[PDB]
Design a protein around this ligand. Sequence first.
Ligand SMILES: CC1=C(/C=C/C(C)=C/C=C/C(C)=C/C=C/C=C(C)/C=C/C=C(C)/C=C/C=C(C)/C=C/[C@H](O)C(C)(C)O[C@@H]2O[C@@H](COC(=O)CCCCCCCCCCCC(C)C)[C@@H](O)[C@H](O)[C@H]2O)C(C)(C)CCC1=O
Ligand SMILES: *C/C=C(C)/C=C/C=C(C)/C=C/C1=C(C)CCCC1(C)C
Length: 252
Amino acid sequence: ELPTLTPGQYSLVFNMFSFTVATMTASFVFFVLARNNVAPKYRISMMVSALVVFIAGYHYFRITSSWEAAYALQNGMYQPTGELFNDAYRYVDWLLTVPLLTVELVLVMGLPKNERGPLAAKLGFLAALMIVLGYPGEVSENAALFGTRGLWGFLSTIPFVWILYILFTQLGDTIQRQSSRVSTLLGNARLLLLATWGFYPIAYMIPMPSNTPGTIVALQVGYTIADVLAKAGYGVLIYNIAKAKSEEEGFN
Ligand SMILES: CC1=C(/C=C/C(C)=C/C=C/C(C)=C/C=C/C=C(C)/C=C/C=C(C)/C=C/C=C(C)/C=C/[C@H](O)C(C)(C)O[C@@H]2O[C@@H](COC(=O)CCCCCCCCCCCC(C)C)[C@@H](O)[C@H](O)[C@H]2O)C(C)(C)CCC1=O
Ligand SMILES: *C/C=C(C)/C=C/C=C(C)/C=C/C1=C(C)CCCC1(C)C
């Protein structure tokens, strides 16, 4: 039973969702169109990045719709309509997009081709498992650290740190081995991943006021900003990495 909202709280969220649907659609066309601005060996990362924002565009379209159908303007206030606001769309969006986000980065990393598929496979499945393990905790009724939410948050953190560990301490021989420009861009993408991905378990723990206007607005706005940055913003960095590499490899 979502709380009644002021026009300002309702509109801030609604426009934020609408902006994200527009931004993901633009990113999809940009990444699709960008396919041909990079060498052939990197067009796969661009198709993966286009898939990521297409899937997020679609889910945010569902999210925007659900938000609107869940409220009605009555006397200068947005009152719950009885229709449920579905939070699952974002969770399903994470399950499908997080593995691809890791594969994208692996493909522009500059690893020898005998190391590329194994790393994409390991990181992609660790990311999927991280989301799977978070599931029981997110649908949990009790937000206790010493309870269901803390248990699954802990289990899910395992594959998460495992991924972070690999990106920050198991690849050095590769990033450092790149030109300054590329090494820099790659370092920035890894850092953007840490910062944006880091937001999610932090928001997960905050509960550890359930449904007051201020808490739903803050959470929806925070998750939406993080999703935009972790997928569209991050995709732009992946694109500039593929581009710079393509130019170095004297490609036209
Ligand atoms: C869930 C749960 C649990 C688990 C909890 C867990 C796992 C919690 C985990 C928390 C985590 C992982 C938190 C992580 C936090 C990470 C943070 C705060 C990272 C901050 C990073 C910062 C401030 C980075 C600054 C980087 C800078 C100034 C870089 C400068 C570059 O060298 C420059 C030269 C400027 O790069 C240029 O800009 C580039 C542009 O890209 C960039 O500038 C890259 C952007 C990267 C910056 C990211 C900052 C985002 C803000 C942080 C938000 C905080 C949120 C986490 C709340 C290129 O355009 C140019 O080509 C390049 O030359 C338990 C407790 C275990 C159990 C219970 C339970 O349930
Ligand atoms: C576009 C969506 C992205 C980048 C989503 C990333 C989500 C995570 C890194 C989620 C992590 C979680 C944990 C590390 C533990 C607690 C439960 C989760 C699923 C919120």
